[PDB]
């Protein structure tokens, strides 16, 4: 039969932690209407419970640890997600996870980093000399610790940011000192 995919989320859905249950309940309908695959929204912890999922704070926290003031994500907990996926699988529907890896949001703390400013038009052309700024680049995941992964983030794992916390300035920064 023809394969048909469905994006199973919308931007303004309610933050009631019931999305995974909704999907689990929707498996029969999806199957009878020919959906063979569903793309689910980012399942990992965002910068807050209400984050649609593109804030991307912790990739190993699929609504499992208490971080960002909540255990579950906007959509639900890891268990509900797992139950939903099992229903889909029992009906031969595939599940495509969203991968948000261009940035990280919601750093646990700032770090003093050396940066230069770049041209907003030509984001390469440096329009400033190096100077210390405070950037939200430290990720240690206090709620999770080292469960699943002990990797911690620091300014050098990044290229830059658009906010200097010290001066509270919005400029385009590129971390020096080998970032």
């Amino acid at each position: 039969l023809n394969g048909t995919l469905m994006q199973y989320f919308e931007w303004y859905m309610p933050n009631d932690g019931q999305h995974w249950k909704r999907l689990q309940n929707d498996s029969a309908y999806l199957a009878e209407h020919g959906i063979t695959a569903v793309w689910i929204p980012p399942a990992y912890k965002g910068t807050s419970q209400a984050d649609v999922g593109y804030g991307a704070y912790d990739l190993y926290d699929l609504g499992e640890f208490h971080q960002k003031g909540t255990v579950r994500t906007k959509y639900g907990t890891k268990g509900e997600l797992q139950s939903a996926i099992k229903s889909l699988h029992s009906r031969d529907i595939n599940v495509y996870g969203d991968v948000v890896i261009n940035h990280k949001g919601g750093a646990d703390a700032t770090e003093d980093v050396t940066a230069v400013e770049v041209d907003p038009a030509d984001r390469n052309r440096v329009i400033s000399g190096e100077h210390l700024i405070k950037a939200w680049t430290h990720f240690h995941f206090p709620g999770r610790g080292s469960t699943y992964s002990d990797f911690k983030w620091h300014w050098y794992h990044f290229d830059g940011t658009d906010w200097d916390e010290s001066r509270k300035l919005n400029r385009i920064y590129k971390f020096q000192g080998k970032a």
């Binding site: 048909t4 699988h89 996870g97 890896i101």
Partner: protein, 290 residues
Amino acid sequence: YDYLMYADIDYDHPDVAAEIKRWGTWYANELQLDGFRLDAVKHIKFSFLRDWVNHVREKTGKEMFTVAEYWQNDLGALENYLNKTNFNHSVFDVPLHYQFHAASTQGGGYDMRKLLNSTVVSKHPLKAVTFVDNHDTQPGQSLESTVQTWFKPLAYAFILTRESGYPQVFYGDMYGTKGDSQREIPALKHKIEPILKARKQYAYGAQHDYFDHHDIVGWTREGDSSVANSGLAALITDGPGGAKRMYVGRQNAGETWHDITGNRSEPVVINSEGWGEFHVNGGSVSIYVQ
């Protein structure tokens, strides 16, 4: 403005590349995922993405279908990306979405014949994920460019009943969007279900395109022996309604077909030679099946 405080991941850093590759496999295994949707690939190192997709499939031994969101209304940029990534994954057909949007906002003035060119599906049918609207194009979103509701079912018939492309149905279109503008997408569920049915049990066999008119365009599927009663004749119109004689395959001559969308009550009988004269109402869509 919280996004201003996010940090851009550096993929030139060996540990970062090794870490994302490893997480990738963990994500896949923890959730038993069957594939991925790659976000914002335009700002990420192309070679890394190509390697990450290869890595994950290798470590899992699974097919791992992958579709990347390279948001560029330009076939040239998308094609380059496909080349730089070794065609190891598909991309969303951004150009096609933009034409759907253009057609819907020009009230019949659009040249429907244009739909056939400048799209990923036109060039790379096997590397295109076609969609009508998504969470960034819906009312009030960053890339807002919603396909007007009246045109919506025509856009769906296009991506769901044609042979090319891996079509994607949108949750917001099915159940409506819950934003707070006076332009929210309503639940078109009742209007897309018949089109989904057509794709499911009728969109099979050879295809015949009839994009020979500024407004009324259509296509057929001869059906295939493996699927019983398969075969269809789709007609969509930008402006004024009308009719078109279309070939559905001499194989189903003498059959009486009916508009599965119900927009038309009149049956169409296929002649001895496999031809039919199908009808469509203005600013409407008609999908005749047996």
